[PDB]
Enzyme design. Structure first.
Site, PDB file in Angstrom:
ATOM      1  N   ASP A 173       0.740  -1.252   0.000  1.00 26.07           N
ATOM      2  CA  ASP A 173       0.000   0.000   0.000  1.00 26.07           C
ATOM      3  C   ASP A 173       0.781   1.322   0.000  1.00 26.07           C
ATOM      4  O   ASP A 173       1.251   1.760   1.051  1.00 26.07           O
ATOM      5  CB  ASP A 173      -0.911  -0.047   1.236  1.00 26.07           C
ATOM      6  CG  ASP A 173      -1.974   1.012   1.232  1.00 26.07           C
ATOM      7  OD1 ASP A 173      -2.587   1.215   2.301  1.00 26.07           O
ATOM      8  OD2 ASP A 173      -2.219   1.619   0.167  1.00 26.07           O
TER       9      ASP A 173
ATOM     10  N   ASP B 208      -2.156   5.624  -5.262  1.00 22.81           N
ATOM     11  CA  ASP B 208      -2.303   4.591  -4.244  1.00 22.81           C
ATOM     12  C   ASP B 208      -2.561   3.186  -4.766  1.00 22.81           C
ATOM     13  O   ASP B 208      -3.642   2.894  -5.283  1.00 22.81           O
ATOM     14  CB  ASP B 208      -3.449   4.999  -3.306  1.00 22.81           C
ATOM     15  CG  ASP B 208      -3.602   4.076  -2.119  1.00 22.81           C
ATOM     16  OD1 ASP B 208      -4.509   4.340  -1.296  1.00 22.81           O
ATOM     17  OD2 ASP B 208      -2.825   3.102  -2.005  1.00 22.81           O
TER      18      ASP B 208
END
Lengths: 6, 327
Positions: free
Chosen positions: B34, B214
Site C-alpha cells: 500500500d 495509491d
C-alpha cells in the site's frame, strides 16, 4: 471497493 | 541484480497481494503493498476477530528476534480501522531482511466485510514517515541507508490475469516493465505519494488538484460534489446504499480521463474504468469510481490507473514517475 490511510 | 523483487499475485483480476515475512523463524503473510499508508501490520496470534480465524497469524513467542513494545495503536483506512499494539521483529521482503517496528493487529471487526471476503493477512505501508502513526521511517528508506539496495525507490508493475504476473521492485528501475521513458512529477508533500495535476473528467475540470497515487486503492476516487456532477449527465446509476455505480457498456459518452501537469499528460481510457457486471450478459457495466471526501480537491488514482501506467516511487527525487506498462 477498497481504499487503503486517513 | 541487487534489486529486491517481490511478485504480486492476482486474485480474480480485481486485487493483488505479495508475500512478506516477520520474525527470525520467517512466518509468511500475504500482504497488500500500500503506497497509501505508512505502517506495517500482520494479524496477531492474540487476535480473537473471526476474520483472524482464517488468516495467517503472527506468534511472537516463536521468534528470538522479537522485541516487545506493547504500545497500543489504531490505523484508520478509508475501508475501516484495525487495532493492536507495536512490536519489533525481523521483517523480510524478497531476499532482503531487517528489524522493523510493526503492529500486531488484534482487532479487525471494523475492516469487515472486506477483510474476510478478500485474501490478505496484513498491510505493508510504502508511504512517507509523516503518514505513519508512530513516526516510522519507510523501510525502503531504511534499506537504502543500510546499503542493501542501490536506490531509495520502488516500482509497481501490476499483473494482468491470464497474461502475466506483476512485481513490486525495490532498489532500481527495470526497463522490461514499460514502454518509452519515465516522466516524473514532484510531490506537493512527502506524506502520501501526492502530486499536483489538472483533473479532466470530460468537460469537468479541477485545476491544480491534489492527486494521490495509491496501489492500495481499487478505484479512482473524486470529491463527492465533483463525481456526482460527472455521473449526472452520463446516465450512471448508483445502487442504493452501495459504493457501486453502473451504466450501459455501450455508453459512448464515457470520456477519457486526463491528468495534466505542466509538462506531461496522463490519460485513462474508459476501458480501464468500466467492466461488464455479468460474465454472460454484457449489457450493464460497472464504473470503477468512488466518491471520497478527504478535502475539496483531493483525488485518488488507484489500481485502474496503475494497470495502465508503470509507476516509480523515488524518495530521493521526492517524485512519482510514470510510463506505459508493457503487455
Amino acid at each position: 471497493x477498497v481504499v487503503x490511510a486517513x | 541484480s541487487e534489486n529486491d523483487v517481490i511478485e504480486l499475485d492476482d486474485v480474480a483480476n480485481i486485487m493483488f497481494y505479495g508475500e512478506g515475512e516477520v520474525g527470525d523463524n520467517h512466518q509468511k503473510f500475504m500482504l497488500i503493498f500500500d503506497t497509501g499508508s505508512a505502517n506495517l501490520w500482520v494479524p496477531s496470534k492474540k487476535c480473537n476477530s473471526s476474520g483472524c480465524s482464517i488468516k495467517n497469524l503472527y506468534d511472537s513467542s516463536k521468534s528470538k528476534s522479537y522485541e516487545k513494545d506493547g504500545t497500543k495503536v489504531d490505523i484508520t483506512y478509508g475501508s475501516g480501522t484495525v487495532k493492536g499494539f507495536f512490536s519489533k521483529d525481523l521483517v523480510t521482503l524478497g531476499h532482503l531482511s531487517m528489524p522493523y517496528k510493526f503492529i500486531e493487529v488484534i482487532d479487525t471487526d471494523d475492516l469487515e466485510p472486506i477483510y474476510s471476503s478478500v485474501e490478505f493477512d496484513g498491510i505493508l505501508g510504502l508511504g512517507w514517515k509523516d503518514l505513519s502513526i508512530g513516526s516510522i521511517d519507510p523501510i525502503v528508506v531504511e534499506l537504502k541507508n543500510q546499503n542493501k539496495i542501490d536506490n531509495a525507490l520502488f516500482t509497481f508493475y501490476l499483473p494482468v490475469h491470464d497474461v502475466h504476473a506483476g512485481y513490486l521492485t525495490i532498489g532500481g528501475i527495470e526497463e522490461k516493465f514499460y514502454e518509452g521513458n519515465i516522466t516524473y512529477e514532484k510531490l506537493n508533500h512527502d506524506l502520501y505519494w501526492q502530486i499536483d495535476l489538472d483533473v479532466h473528467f470530460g468537460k469537468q475540470t479541477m485545476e491544480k488538484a491534489n492527486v494521490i497515487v495509491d496501489s492500495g486503492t481499487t478505484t479512482i476516487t473524486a470529491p463527492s460534489e465533483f463525481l456526482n456532477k460527472f455521473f449526472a449527465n452520463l446516465n450512471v446509476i448508483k445502487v442504493p446504499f452501495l459504493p457501486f455505480y453502473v451504466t450501459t457498456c455501450d455508453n459512448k459518452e464515457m470520456p477519457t480521463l486526463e491528468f495534466k501537469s505542466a509538462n506531461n499528460t496522463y490519460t485513462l481510457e474508459p476501458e480501464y474504468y468500466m467492466n461488464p457486471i455479468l460474465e454472460v450478459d454484457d449489457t450493464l457495466c460497472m464504473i470503477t469510481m468512488l466518491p471520497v471526501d478527504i478535502d475539496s480537491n483531493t483525488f485518488i488514482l488507484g489500481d485502474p490507473f496503475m494497470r495502465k501506467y508503470f509507476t516509480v516511487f523515488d524518495y530521493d527525487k521526492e517524485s512519482v514517475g510514470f510510463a506505459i506498462a508493457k503487455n
